[model samples]
Target: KSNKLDHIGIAVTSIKDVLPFYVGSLKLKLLGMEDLPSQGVKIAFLEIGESKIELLEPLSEESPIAKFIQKRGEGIHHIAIGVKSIEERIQEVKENGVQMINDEPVPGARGAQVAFLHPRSARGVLYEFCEKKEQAEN
Candidate 1:
């Protein structure tokens, strides 16, 4: 299974406040934004080179980002990588003795499949693997 760094997610208290910095100062193109109620966060993405920078704003006090910000302030939250096949990648990693945070793949934003690797197995940072949805032919 082939994999490449997809995006870097950063925790932010406000998306509006952070957009100017990433778009204006950094000159990154704003890709899009989405609200993930299941994850309790609002997400915005900016294209940077072949990869992306994702901005995350917590929608509720109980959100993971909110807790992260409360403990460490706004900063890098997690890094996601794209794989050709998420299921195959997960199996390969599992066979390699890597611990996973999720036992099954879950729905992700941007029409992608995603799974998380346990921080205990992957140093201290959360690692996410994603696979883009296949397009339908006309």
Candidate 2:
């Protein structure tokens, strides 16, 4: 679906400590978080609510998100949402006075153009919009 909750990010001290509930009890299902050192965190996906739940834990105490975890108590690192059109959506929000973090879309995973925004309106939430790149006729 377009313009929908693509995933939920949860910050944690360590995945090992939380897996027991995610995998063992709730039995959501997944092997483990995958290291994304370039992004300064390890992440994993659990299928839920027709979307994904991302388990994110910083790579080091000095990581960019380390303080976020400390201040926010290690939960909901960000919100990732799918957008039908990045340009349209970005404009829609900015026209209404929302602030954008990225001046332009950055290359994102799986052929999606990603943009970041921080709205003090939604205080303490990092918002991401993912627009799929359209394919050309061969």
Candidate 3:
């Protein structure tokens, strides 16, 4: 039920080409980079003030990011929000009759828990919710 803007995911063909703009020109700190084979993409995180910005580049042509760029060009892909409890949030949204893209939480970059809400239910904007693994450690 709690909605807090987490990070905005951008689909790009190459992170190397864009890194200069986001990290060098914009001065956003580069958090890290990871290749998520399960998701079929490589991702890089950059700190932007209080929130984070995620850059996703497809590892294969079949990957969703590649398709997104082919269809809509390189741009904003999805917006994610942090959740204290992903299960609780999913249950709450389901109970409220909101449509979800994923039936369950799946592995995300950097071992975070994530789930997607259907764009149809969110006014044509795909939404994602994540719970950082580090939070559980704390």
Candidate 4:
């Protein structure tokens, strides 16, 4: 169950609004954008040293991002960590008494299987476990 931080998820009203600041002021390059309907978001990625920044914009008012913003305001959402065999890691977390929002992996941005852990278990911070290359079977 090896895990390392892969990216930080930031919820925003629009990537267009935040891109200029990161790409212009901070000087982070925009990797690209992807529409992840399964998660109800349009995501934009920015490379930053070892890890990356993921900007998430809600697809609709009913989307999770929209609901999150409406409840907490647009800002840092979650911290994602890369893992080997997301299924195993998920079971490990559960056995250790972590409350997971998703019992199983779901469609994620780029090529990954992502599962979110509820903030309640992580001291009010959402944690995402991202596994690559196993999405074909998902």
lDDT for 63 in candidate 4 is 93
List the pairs of residues colliding in candidate 2: none
Give the TM-score (vs. native) of candidate 3.
0.92
- Give the per-residue lDDT of model 1 (tens digit) for 1-138: 367889998999999998889999999999889999999999998998889998999999999899999999999988999988889889989999999987689987787888999999988999999889656688
lDDT computed for candidate 1: 0.91
Candidate 2 structure, TM-score to reference: 0.80
TM-score of every prediction relative to native: 0.93, 0.80, 0.92, 0.92
Q: Each prediction's Cα RMSD? A: 1.9, 3.7, 2.0, 3.6
Off by over 4 Å in 2: 107-112, 132-138
State residue 87's C-alpha deviation in candidate 2, in Å.
Answer: 2.8
Evaluated at residue 91, the lDDT of candidate 3 is 95
Residues 60-110 of candidate 2 have per-residue lDDT tens digits of: 987766777877787777788987888888888889888888758886444
> lDDT by residue for model 4 over 63-131, one digit each (tens)?
999999999999999999999888998998899999999999987888788999999998898999998
